[PDB]
Amino acid sequence: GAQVSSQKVGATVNYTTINYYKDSASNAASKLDFSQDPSKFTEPVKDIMIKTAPALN
Amino acid sequence: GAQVSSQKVGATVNYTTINYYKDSASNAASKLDFSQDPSKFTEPVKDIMIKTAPALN
Amino acid sequence: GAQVSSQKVGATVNYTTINYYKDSASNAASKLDFSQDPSKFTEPVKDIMIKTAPALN
Amino acid sequence: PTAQSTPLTSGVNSQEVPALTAVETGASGQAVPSDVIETRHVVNYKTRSESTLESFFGRSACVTILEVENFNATTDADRKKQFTTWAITYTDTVQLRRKLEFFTYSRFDLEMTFVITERYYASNTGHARNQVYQLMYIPPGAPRPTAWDDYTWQSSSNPSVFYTYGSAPPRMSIPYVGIANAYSHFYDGFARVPLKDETVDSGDTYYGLVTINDFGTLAVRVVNEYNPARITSKIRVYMKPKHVRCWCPRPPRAVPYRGEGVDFKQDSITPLTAVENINTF
Amino acid sequence: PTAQSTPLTSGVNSQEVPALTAVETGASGQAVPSDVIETRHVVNYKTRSESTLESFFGRSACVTILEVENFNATTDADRKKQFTTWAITYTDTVQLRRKLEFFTYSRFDLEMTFVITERYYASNTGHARNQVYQLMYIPPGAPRPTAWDDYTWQSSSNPSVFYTYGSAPPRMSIPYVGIANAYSHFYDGFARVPLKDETVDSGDTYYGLVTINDFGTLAVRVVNEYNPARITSKIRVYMKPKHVRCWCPRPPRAVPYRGEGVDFKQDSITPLTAVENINTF
Amino acid sequence: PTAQSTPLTSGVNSQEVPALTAVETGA
Amino acid sequence: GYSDRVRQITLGNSTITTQEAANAVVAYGEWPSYLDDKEANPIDAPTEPDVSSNRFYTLDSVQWKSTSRGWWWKLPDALKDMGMFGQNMYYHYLGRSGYTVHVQCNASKFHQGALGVFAIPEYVMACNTEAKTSYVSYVNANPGEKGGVFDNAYNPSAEASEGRKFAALDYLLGCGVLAGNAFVYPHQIINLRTNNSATLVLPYVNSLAIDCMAKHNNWGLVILPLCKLDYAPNSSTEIPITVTIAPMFTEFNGLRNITVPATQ
Amino acid sequence: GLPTMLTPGSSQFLTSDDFQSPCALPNFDVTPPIHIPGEVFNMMELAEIDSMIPMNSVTGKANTMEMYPIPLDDKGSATPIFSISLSPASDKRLQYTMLGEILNYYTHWTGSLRFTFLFCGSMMATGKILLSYSPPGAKPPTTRKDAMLGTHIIWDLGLQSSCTMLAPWISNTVYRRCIKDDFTEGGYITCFYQTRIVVPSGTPTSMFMLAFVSACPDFSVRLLRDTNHISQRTLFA
Amino acid sequence: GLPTMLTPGSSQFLTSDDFQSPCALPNFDVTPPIHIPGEVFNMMELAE
Amino acid sequence: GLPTMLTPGSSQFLTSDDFQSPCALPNFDVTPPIHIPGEVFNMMELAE
Numbered sequence A, B, C: 001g002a003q004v005s006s007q008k009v010g011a012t013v014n015y016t017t018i019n020y021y022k023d024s025a026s027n028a029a030s031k032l033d034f035s036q037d038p039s040k041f042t043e044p045v046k047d048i049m050i051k052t053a054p055a056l057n
Numbered sequence D, E: 001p002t003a004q005s006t007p008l009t010s011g012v013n014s015q016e017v018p019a020l021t022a023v024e025t026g027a028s029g030q031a032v033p034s035d036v037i038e039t040r041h042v043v044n045y046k047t048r049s050e051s052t053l054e055s056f057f058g059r060s061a062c063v064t065i066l067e068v069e070n071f072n073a074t075t076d077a078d079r080k081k082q083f084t085t086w087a088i089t090y091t092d093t094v095q096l097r098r099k100l101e102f103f104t105y106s107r108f109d110l111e112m113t114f115v116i117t118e119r120y121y122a123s124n125t126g127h128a129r130n131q132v133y134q135l136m137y138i139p140p141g142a143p144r145p146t147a148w149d150d151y152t153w154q155s156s157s158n159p160s161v162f163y164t165y166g167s168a169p170p171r172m173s174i175p176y177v178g179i180a181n182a183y184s185h186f187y188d189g190f191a192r193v194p195l196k197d198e199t200v201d202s203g204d205t206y207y208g209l210v211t212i213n214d215f216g217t218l219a220v221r222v223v224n225e226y227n228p229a230r231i232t233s234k235i236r237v238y239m240k241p242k243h244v245r246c247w248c249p250r251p252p253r254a255v256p257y258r259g260e261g262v263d264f265k266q267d268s269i270t271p272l273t274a275v276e277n278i279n280t281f
Numbered sequence F: 001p002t003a004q005s006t007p008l009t010s011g012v013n014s015q016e017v018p019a020l021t022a023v024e025t026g027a
Numbered sequence G: 001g002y003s004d005r006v007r008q009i010t011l012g013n014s015t016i017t018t019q020e021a022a023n024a025v026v027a028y029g030e031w032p033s034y035l036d037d038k039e040a041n042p043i044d045a046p047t048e049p050d051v052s053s054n055r056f057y058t059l060d061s062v063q064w065k066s067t068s069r070g071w072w073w074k075l076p077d078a079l080k081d082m083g084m085f086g087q088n089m090y091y092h093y094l095g096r097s098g099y100t101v102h103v104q105c106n107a108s109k110f111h112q113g114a115l116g117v118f119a120i121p122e123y124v125m126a127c128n129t130e131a132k133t134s135y136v137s138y139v140n141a142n143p144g145e146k147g148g149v150f151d152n153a154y155n156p157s158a159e160a161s162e163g164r165k166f167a168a169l170d171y172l173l174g175c176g177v178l179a180g181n182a183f184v185y186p187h188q189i190i191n192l193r194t195n196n197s198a199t200l201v202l203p204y205v206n207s208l209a210i211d212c213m214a215k216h217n218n219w220g221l222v223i224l225p226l227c228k229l230d231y232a233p234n235s236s237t238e239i240p241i242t243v244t245i246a247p248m249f250t251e252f253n254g255l256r257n258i259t260v261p262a263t264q
Numbered sequence H: 001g002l003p004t005m006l007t008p009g010s011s012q013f014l015t016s017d018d019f020q021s022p023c024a025l026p027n028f029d030v031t032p033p034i035h036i037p038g039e040v041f042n043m044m045e046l047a048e049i050d051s052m053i054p055m056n057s058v059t060g061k062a063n064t065m066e067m068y069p070i071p072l073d074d075k076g077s078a079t080p081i082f083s084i085s086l087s088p089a090s091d092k093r094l095q096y097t098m099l100g101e102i103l104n105y106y107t108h109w110t111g112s113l114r115f116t117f118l119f120c121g122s123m124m125a126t127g128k129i130l131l132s133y134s135p136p137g138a139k140p141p142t143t144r145k146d147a148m149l150g151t152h153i154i155w156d157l158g159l160q161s162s163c164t165m166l167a168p169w170i171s172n173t174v175y176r177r178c179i180k181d182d183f184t185e186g187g188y189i190t191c192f193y194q195t196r197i198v199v200p201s202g203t204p205t206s207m208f209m210l211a212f213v214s215a216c217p218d219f220s221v222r223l224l225r226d227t228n229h230i231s232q233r234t235l236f237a
Numbered sequence I, J: 001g002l003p004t005m006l007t008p009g010s011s012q013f014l015t016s017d018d019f020q021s022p023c024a025l026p027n028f029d030v031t032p033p034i035h036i037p038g039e040v041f042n043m044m045e046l047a048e
Helices: D053-057 D096-102 E053-057 E095-100 G085-091 G179-184 H043-047 H098-103 I041-045 J045-046
Strands: A003-006 A012-017 B003-006 B014-017 C005-006 C014-017 D061-070 D083-087 D103-120 D132-138 D160-164 D173-174 D215-222 D232-247 E061-070 E083-087 E101-119 E132-138 E159-163 E169-172 E217-222 E230-251 G007-011 G016-018 G062-064 G069-075 G090-106 G112-122 G188-189 G199-204 G218-228 G239-255 H002-006 H068-073 H084-087 H106-110 H113-119 H129-132 H151-156 H160-169 H188-193 H206-215 H221-225 I004-005 J002-004
Touching: C014 H160, D053 D232, D061 D083, D061 D096, D061 D215, D083 G239, D096 J002, D103 E132, D132 D232, D160 I004, D173 E061, D215 D232, E053 E230, E061 E083, E061 E095, E061 E217, E132 E230, G007 G239, G016 G090, G069 G239, G085 G090, G085 G239, G090 G112, G112 G199, G179 G218, G179 H098, G188 G199, G199 G239, G218 H206, H043 H098, H043 H206, H043 H221, H068 H221, H098 H106, H098 H206, H113 H129, H129 H160, H151 H160
Parallel strands: H002 I004, H002 J002
Antiparallel strands: A003 A012, B003 B014, C005 C014, D061 D232, D083 D215, D103 D173, D103 D232, D132 D160, D132 D215, E061 E230, E083 E217, E101 E169, E101 E230, E132 E159, E132 E217, G007 G016, G062 G239, G069 G218, G090 G199, G090 G239, G112 G188, G112 G218, H068 H206, H084 H188, H106 H221, H113 H160, H113 H206, H129 H151, H129 H188
C-alpha cells in the first residue's frame, strides 16, 4: 500500500512512501497545505469593502 | 502478501504490514479488539431486569 | 517472486518469503513435511496382518 | 467503535423508576445520566482503544535482574560467579505481576528482551576485550550447568542467544508454552494427594501455583575467558505479553507481596490512610 | 499553488480610487502595485511552500539539557547525581518557544530526539565500560524515582527507551496528548476560584498557564553500576512539532524572557536601538 | 495434518481379538 | 403473577423453594454443560452419574452473630463426603462439575444485616507463618463441609508448623486484596429487609477441561457480613445460615481404586 | 547489497515498541484453545462493575471491614451523612475501589460515574435521603439547602433496596487528570436526611448503608502509566 | 537475512530530516478536534 | 540510500533462528539423489 506523490521541484519526479507504523503520530511531515485566506486577519469586516469604492460613504 | 490497515488517528492514513517469520508468536501486537459486553460481570442475572421496571415484584 | 504461506498457529496468519541467493543451500528451513508411515518399521511383514484377526493361523 | 453518546432527554413524571434497583440480585447499578437528569445530545467520538487487553499489557516490563562476572576464579564460590541460572517467572518483580493478577487465567505469546550492562571491578588490573554473552533457555529436564565452560553450553537442542556487548538489546518471541489450555495465575490446590497412613512427609509440603509451575531455567554466562581486569555484568530481563486473552477478573493486589504466592506481611496490611472525618472533601 | 502574478495595466483617470481607504475599519491596506502604477505582466512561478506551518515548525529544536553521572556515590547529594528528572516543557529554551508563541493555540504530534554525550571526570581512576541509558517517561500520577536503582525503573507501564552509548540518537513520536482540544500557549486564568472568607491561602498562588499545565516527567539514569572512573553525561532533548495546526496569531516576543510565563526583566525592555534622526536611510 | 483422534466405542463380546498378537513376526 | 422473589429449583430427588429471593445469578453468564468432543482431553469413556450425584446436598448450618467475621468453603471439597457425588469423586482420578449454590438465611422484619455471598474462581488464600511462603497443609486447606471462618486479626505463628493454615483476614479477603472489590466475582447479597436466600449457578471454571478434584478446588464460596447483624430486643441473638449445594453436569474420568486422603 | 541508511532511533529499545522477533521455539504446536467462562476484552468492562467505597475509613475503622458501612440513625441530624470529592483516582477513599485501581494505571479519564446505595436497615425502617453532586467552582456544600441546588436525587426507602445517583460528565476539559489537581477538580458529592429515618419500637435505631461506585458506558481512559499502589525494595526468589 | 549496505549519512541526526519514528504511546485516542476561530495555515498570512 | 532503522535483536545469534545465508561454494552440483530404503520423516515414527 504505497502512496506516490510529486516531490518538490529542484534545479522520476515522484517519490514513494509506505507508512511502517500503526499510529498516525509516527508518520512523517504532512504533505504541503497551500490553504490560505488572510481575509480573517487582513479584512475581518462585516460589510464588504470594494477596493475601488470609498471605505466610508 | 502485504496487509494494509487504518492506523490510529492522531492530530495516507493506512500502514503496511508484512509478516517476516514463520511462527505467529513472532508477530507484532494483535489489531485492536473492540469486543465487549460487561453484562457477564455487571448483570449476570438469570431473569432479565428491565431498568425502568422494578427489580423486585 | 514472493511465496506466501500459513505460519504456525500461536495463541494476518500468513508470512512472506523471498529467496535472496542463487543456491538452494542458502535457503531457510524446509516447509513442514507431515509425511509419515511407520509401517516400514512397526509392521514390515510380507503378509498383511489384520488387527482383529489372529496373527498366526 | 466508540464509547457511548448521550441522547437529548428532558424530564419525566412516570411510574417508570430507573433510579431504583436492588443490588442484592448480583447486578450492578445500570442507570445512566439520561435516566435521572435532563441531558443534551452529545456525540461521543472517544474510544476505549487504550484499555483493550493488548494495549494494557503491550509493554516490555522488567521481571528480574541477574548478575554474572568474568575473572580468574581460584575458589569455588568465585567459579559460581562465572555463570548464573534463574527460574523463569513473572513473580520476582511486582509491577507486571500485579497487572497479570487482575485475571485468574490468561493466554499469550511472550516477547523476551534483555538489557546487558558492564562495569570494571577495579582500575589497576589492565583492560578487557569486548565480551560475548550466552543466554541459554534450559527447558525442564535438560541438564543444568555446574561450570561456566562445561558441556551443557554447546546447546545442540536448547535455544541459546549469543549477544555481543554494545549491540542492540537482544530479543526473541516465545509461544504460549502452557501445558494447560491457559496459564493459571492462581491454583487453589496441590501437586499431589496425600493419602491415609502413608510414610511420605507432609509436614514441609507447599500449596498452590508454586507446587505445579515450572517454565524452566535461563542460564547466562560470558563466553570469554578471563581478562586481567575483572568485569561484573548485569542482565535485566523484560517480558511483554502479546496476542493476549484473559479470563475471570479479580481484585487487584492491595498490599505488598512477600513471596511468589498470595501471602501478606504483618507490618504492611494498612493500605488506606484514615480520613479526618466521613465528611471530608 | 503559487504567489500572485502581476497583470499588465496602464494608467487611469477615474472616480475609482483604490489608493485611498480607511484603516479605522479594522481592515489592513489592500491595494497592490497594479492599483497605483503602470505594471507589466509578470508570471509568478514562486510558491510559499516554506512558510506553511509544517515547514516553519519542521525542525528538531533543543528544548533542554540534562546531566546525569555514574560513580560510586557515598554521600546523599552524590546519590542524586546517579539519575535526574525533568518537568517536560518547551519553555526552558527560547528559540522554539518563541516560534510556537506566534500562536495562542496549537495542535500537533511530537518527534522527540535525544543527543547523549560523555566525558571522563579525571584521568587516573582507570577506565569505564560502555554505558546504557534509560529514559523513562513518567506521566502525571506515576511514582517518581528517589534513587537511580529503585523499583520505579522496571517501567511495566511507563514508556522507557534504553539507549546504548555510541548508537544513533534515539527517537520516538508522541501523539497530541492534550486534555483540551488544542494546546494553549497562553491561559489568562487560574487553576481554581478563591472563594469568600476561606482559610486557604491565596497570598502565594500563581497565575496562568503554569498553574494548569503538566505533561509529566522525564527521568534519566545510567543503567550501569559504577566504574572506578567517574563518567559525567549530558542529555540534550529535542522537539519537532509535526502534523501542525495553529490558531489565533499573536505578536512575537520582543524582549528577553525571564520565566516560564510572560513576565519581562527591567534591565531588558529596550529592544530598539534609537535612530540618529527620523530621516535616516 | 494432526495426530490421531479417538473414536467413540463401547464394549465387545466377540471372536475378534485385537488385544492379542504375535511379535515374533517382526511387527 | 410470577415475581422473581418466588422461585423453585429441582435437581434429582431434591427441591428448594424460596418466597423472598432476589433473582438468581448465572456466573459469568454461563450455564454448566457437559464436556464437548472438540474440547475433550482424557479419552476413556467418562462416567456421568446424573441424578445420583447431581442433587442438593445440605451442609451443617452456621450461626450468624453480631460478632461474626465470615465463613468460607471450597468446592468440590465441601461435598467430598456427600453421598454418591463423594464416591464418584474419589473413585476417579479426574472430575468436573458445575454447581447450584443456595444460601439460606431468614430472620424478621425487625432484624437487620447484610451478607455478601461470593463465588471465587481459584480462591487461593494466604498462609499463617512468615517463616515460609505458600505454606498450607492439605488438611487445613480442605476442611470439608464444616468450612472455615474469617477473622479480623492476623497473628502469624512463630514456629513454622503452627501456622500451616490459612490466614483468613476478612478485609483482605484472605488473599491480599481489599474485600470491597469482591463484587467482581459472581455474587449476591442477602440483605435481611429484602431477601432470605441467595442463588448462584456456577459453570466449571478452570484452565483445563477436566482436573483432579482431590488435588484442586475450583471455586471458593465466601460469606462476609457487610453490615453486621442487629436485633434490638437482644443483640446477642444468632440466626442460622444454611448452605445447600448441588453438583451439575458431573463427569468423571480415570477410574481406579478409591482415593482416601490423609486426615492429619 | 541493497543501499540503505539508518535513521535516528536505530538499535534503541523502546519498551512500548511493536515489532516482530524471531521465535526461540520454531514449529511449536500450542495447546489447542478451549472455551473458558468469564473472558475479558477491555479493562473498562471491569470499571463498569460496582465495588464498595470505603466511605467510613476514619481512625479505628480504616483497614477493617467497618470502613465500608456508612452510619445512619433515626435522629434526623441536619449535618451531612457523608461528603467526598469527585477525584476517583486521587481521593483517599475512592482510589482503592476497583474503578479507582484501574484509573491509577492511566493518566486521563472522562465520563459519568454511577454511585449506587444499598440501605441495610430493617424492613420496618423508612426514610427519605438526599444524594447530591455539586459541580466545582463554588462553596463546598455542608448544608442540605446548598446541596439541593446542585444535581441531586431524593431516595425513598422501600422494597426497592437500592438507589442510583449519577455524577454526569460535567467538565471544562475533555479529560480529567488521574491526580489531585485543581484545574481538573470534579466537584462535591454529599448526602443529607430529606426527612429522617423512622422506626417503631423493637427495632434498631441505628444502622448502615453501603455505597458502590462504577463507570458508565460513556467512560473511557487514556495514557497508560504505572500505578502508585505497588512497589518493592528487593526481588523474590 | 536480506543483503543490504549502509550509505553515507547512516546513523546521523539531521535536525531538518523527515522520517518516521515509533510511537511511545501506541493506540492513544487523541482528543477529538473541534472548530476554533482564527486558524492560520501559512506565515505569509501574518505578513499581509 | 533507503531509510531504515534497526530493531532489538539486531546482530544477535539465536541458535534456533531460521534465516538465509550466502553459500561458500556457489554453483556446486550436488550428488544426484537415489532411493535408499528406510527413510524416516518424523521422530514419532521411531517412538511407535
